[PDB]
RNA sequence: UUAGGCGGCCACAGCGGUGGGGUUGCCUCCCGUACCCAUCCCGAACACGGAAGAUAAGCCCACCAGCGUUCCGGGGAGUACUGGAGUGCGCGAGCCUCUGGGAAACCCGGUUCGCCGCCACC
RNA sequence: AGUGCAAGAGCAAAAGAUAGCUUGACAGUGUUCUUCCCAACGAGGAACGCUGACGCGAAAGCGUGGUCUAGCGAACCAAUU
RNA sequence: CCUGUCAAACUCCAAACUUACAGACGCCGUUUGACGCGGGGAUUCCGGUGCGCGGGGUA
């Protein structure tokens, strides 16, 4: 920018998107990675292998695309994370992909995180990823629970009409079941 | 030479054009190449690890098997057969 | 297809621009090739510009010299035309140099020594010190220039 | 466009720089929560040749807490214009700083995909005169 | 010392006082004479021409230079002239004054680098060219044969 | 790709600036702290939960060359330098001819305000 | 800028700074380069493995001392495990 | 802003050229066995000059 001897980052750093020196060590494996990302309404979990002109994603789920199965809930939260991951764990196994390691970007890996809600699915889905048990959430968390009690603290709807008052851990279970059997896309 | 040390000599071809400095692109750090791969030698000035003896840049050898994740390149030192220990990050596919 | 004469010899000549001379059959002063015009053999000619005379011959100035130096792979044997005929794809000298300029065959693969050891110019050459362009005689030449210099050689 | 082009505060420091302490008490009752240390960097004549080293403290003040201060605070300051930002900020005082920006501001302080605010978007020292002139006082 | 220990190129370029000490100062005294006030805006520009390339050693230029502008006083202390010497005495010069043991000798001076066909000397005046006599005096004090050029002036 | 995720090359992509874009779908800013988690002080950030509002930031889309960069035309320049050769010149320093290569600065005019891969998606 | 010390080189979500934790400055044994270009020569040095035991981290992974190139010593004899 | 100069231990640039590997042609080798492997025997470790490029030195 300033002058010939100016040195600008790579596009993907100046972004802000990837951190390369974690990217080097995730790719040190040589194992697929198991992308975990977030946004405000939504969880996404790609299978990324590498490519020749790029990372090439074997297999995907986003929490959108999770309604197609029967959910009529939010979906940027924990239980919608575990489900994603799970979905994509499978249409992974489905590809013929293995195992994983688990890349969470920017994101940080604090314990009960979405991220790790992903990584939990993504294993029960057949994948076999490093991991560490006690850095995951209780189950319950994973079901919805701490929300369901969230709005037993009630006097207003948690949820905008949506779907329930009350809301519903055992919607959640509803589907997990469904997507461990037979289905399309899976 | 006023000394002998590895890096005699070596302030050229272990230094970054201004432009290419900082830390390298990890997709060449991780190439994987198969025994009997023609491979040039080049050490990345941004890349510490998985170096050579300068004397051998502009060598291009041929893989022969690894160790760890370094490869084992066999190059000709004048009329000398030897074996470099080097990994991707310094390599490059020939042709 | 140029003509090659060397007209300085080894003494102090370097050992690479020697090499090329003998890679180019050419072991002795005097002595003559034919060469294709490519890529690769440019650069060889090109290297040992300053030890040799050049350049296209005219039909008939080849046919005289194959006629007068040509030699058989081995033997003494004159080339003539039965020789050609005899030996040869072609019906006789004419055929022989004519396919040589057109650079469709070669002096070897027609049982021929790849070499042309000529005689000295009756009447002496212009000089090993100064190109053509200065009136001397080393260089790529004429075509008019090659000819006087081999029909001397003859 | 407005609403999410219109001033607000984003955190109130207010800090003490002594030289080497107890005035963190009366931070604590004058804000209302915990204040922090303030390390020094290198050495000097001050006797304050100690690089890590308490030498005063800090508080930072966001939402309510930094209403419910100021609301007494720019009472006990008069001062107002040269003053002020280049960013639409000031600081008078004991020191009480006031940063002041429009919505988007997380976006350059996030982590992933951060990005360094606009000038266009920025807050210029007038358009920040405006904002807190027009809540109880006045500006020069 | 005569020039003839000095005057050639043939050394390496010796020039980096980080790595050279107790060097001379320079006596040339300035490199801008005359009415330095105003800028080039003379009808005549003459030239001095060097035509071999040399080292001229910082005592030449002073003497050069004196000798010119010293004599460019046929125009008057505050005549109506620019006259500029464009070269500076970068390449410091040394002498081994034990005999060739441990010869690298220490510094003594400075001299200027001048490539044949380059110009060391420019005037500016209006016609009334006493400079190029100011030159023919210049030349006389460096070791190179020299050519007087004139550029802007064809009022011949 | 009517806004997305992971990338390769790592400024042709930087710096600066203009215009345009969200009615159910996306990204955001945004709203909010019972939880998992969090600030040597602050739900600022991190994390979690969520849609009342907005397209003003970001982002995506279209575009501008003033700076920086890449490549090209013409000029500089077959100049500077140089591999091979010479009973060519020069007191010498050095130069010249033949042969094979061939620059930099700078000026003027174009180019460049990224290209490409995989996946997902009215 | 900083990174213990020459000089040159490397480094920015770090190789720097701060905090916390930890003792891989670990035992054993090798491959290769270097010492000694080419091209034989010891000590020493480095790079990269493996076996075993550990530290940290969610994990990939990193740790064979200090970002890299100086900081080193045979046989005999003694002490030591 | 304008204007005057430099670098063996400077570099936004940058040759000729030197060099690793590969293919092509050439030349060479398969009764003259190359390339290479193993072994016996040395001499040798005062060099000198021209040309190109040098570093030191008034030379
Ligand atoms: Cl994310
Ligand atoms: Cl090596
Ligand atoms: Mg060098
Ligand atoms: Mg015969
Ligand atoms: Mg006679
Ligand atoms: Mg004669
Ligand atoms: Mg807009
Ligand atoms: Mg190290
Ligand atoms: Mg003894
Ligand atoms: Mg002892
Ligand atoms: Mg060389
Ligand atoms: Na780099
Ligand atoms: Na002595
Ligand atoms: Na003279
Ligand atoms: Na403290
Ligand atoms: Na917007
Ligand atoms: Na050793």
Not at chain 1, 27 to 39: E, F, H, T
Not at chain 3, 99 to 104: D, F, G, K, V, Y
Not at chain 3, 134 to 154: C, F, P, S, V
């Amino acid at each position: 920018a300033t002058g010939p001897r100016y040195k600008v980052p790579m596009r993907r750093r100046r972004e802000a998107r990837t951190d390369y020196h974690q990217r080097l060590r995730l790719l040190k494996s040589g194992k697929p990675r198991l992308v975990a990302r977030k946004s405000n309404k939504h969880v996404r979990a790609q299978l990324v292998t590498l490519g020749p002109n790029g990372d090439d994603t074997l297999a995907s789920a986003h929490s959108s695309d999770l309604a197609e199965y029967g959910w009529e809930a939010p979906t940027g939260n924990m239980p919608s994370a575990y489900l994603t991951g799970l979905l994509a764990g499978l249409r992974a196994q489905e590809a013929g992909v293995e195992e994983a390691v688990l890349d969470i970007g920017l994101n940080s890996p604090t314990p009960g995180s979405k991220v790790f809600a992903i990584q939990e699915g993504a294993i029960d889905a057949g994948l076999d990823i490093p991991h560490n048990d006690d850095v995951l959430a209780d189950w319950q968390r994973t079901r919805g629970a701490h929300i369901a009690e969230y709005d037993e603290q009630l006097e207003e709807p948690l949820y905008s009409g949506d779907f329930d008052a009350a809301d519903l851990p055992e919607h959640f279970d509803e589907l997990r079941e469904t997507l461990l059997d037979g289905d399309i896309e899976l | 030479p006023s000394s002998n040390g590895p890096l005699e000599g070596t302030r050229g071809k272990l230094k970054n054009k201004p432009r290419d400095r900082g830390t390298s692109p990890p997709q060449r750090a991780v190439e994987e190449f198969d025994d009997g791969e023609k491979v040039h030698l080049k050490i990345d000035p941004s890349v510490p690890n998985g170096r050579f003896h300068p004397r051998f840049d502009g060598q291009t050898g041929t893989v022969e098997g690894k160790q760890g994740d370094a490869y084992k390149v066999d190059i000709v030192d004048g009329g000398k057969e030897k074996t470099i220990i080097v990994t991707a990050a310094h390599l490059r596919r020939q042709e | 297809m140029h003509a090659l004469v060397q007209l300085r010899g080894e003494v102090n000549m370097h050992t690479d621009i020697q090499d090329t001379l003998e890679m180019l059959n050419i072991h002795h002063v005097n002595h003559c090739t034919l060469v294709p015009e490519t890529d690769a053999y440019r650069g060889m000619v090109a290297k040992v510009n300053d030890f040799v005379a050049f350049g296209e011959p005219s039909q008939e100035t080849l046919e005289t010299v194959l006629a007068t130096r040509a030699e058989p792979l081995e033997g003494d044997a004159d080339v003539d035309d039965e020789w050609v005929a005899e030996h040869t794809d072609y019906d006789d000298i004419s055929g022989l140099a004519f396919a040589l300029l057109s650079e469709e065959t070669t002096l070897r693969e027609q049982g021929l020594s790849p070499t042309l050891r000529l005689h000295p110019p009756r009447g002496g050459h212009d000089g090993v010190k100064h190109p053509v362009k200065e009136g001397g005689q080393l260089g790529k030449h004429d075509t008019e220039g090659i000819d006087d210099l081999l029909e001397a050689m003859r | 466009f407005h609403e999410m082009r219109e001033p607000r505060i984003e955190k109130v420091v207010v800090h003490m720089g002594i030289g080497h302490a107890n005035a963190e008490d009366i931070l604590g009752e004058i804000t209302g929560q915990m204040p922090v240390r303030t390390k020094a960097k290198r050495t000097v004549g001050e006797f304050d040749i100690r690089e890590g080293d308490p030498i005063g403290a800090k508080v930072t003040l966001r939402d309510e807490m930094a209403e419910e201060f100021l609301q007494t605070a720019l009472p006990l300051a008069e001062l107002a214009t040269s003053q002020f930002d280049d960013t639409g900020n000031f600081s008078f005082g004991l020191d009480v700083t006031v940063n002041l920006v429009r919505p988007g501001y997380r976006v350059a302080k996030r982590d992933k995909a951060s990005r360094s605010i606009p000038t266009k978007h920025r807050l210029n020292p007038a358009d920040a005169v405006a904002f807190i002139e027009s809540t109880y006082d006045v500006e020069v | 010392k005569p020039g003839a220990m000095y005057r050639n190129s043939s050394k390496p370029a010796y020039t980096r006082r980080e790595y050279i000490s107790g060097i001379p100062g320079k006596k040339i005294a300035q490199f801008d004479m005359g009415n330095n006030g105003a800028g080039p805006t003379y009808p005549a520009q003459v030239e001095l021409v060097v035509e071999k390339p040399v080292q001229i050693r910082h005592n030449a230029l002073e003497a050069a230079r004196v000798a010119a502008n010293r004599y460019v006083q046929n125009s008057g202390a505050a005549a109506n002239y620019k006259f500029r010497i464009r070269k500076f005495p970068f390449h410091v010069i040394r002498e081994n004054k034990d005999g060739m043991r441990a010869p690298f000798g220490k510094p003594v001076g400075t001299a200027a680098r001048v490539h044949g066909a380059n110009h060391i000397f420019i005037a500016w005046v209006n016609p009334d060219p006493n400079v190029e006599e100011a030159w023919r005096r210049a030349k006389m004090k460096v070791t190179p044969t020299i050519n007087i050029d004139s550029s802007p002036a064809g009022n011949a």
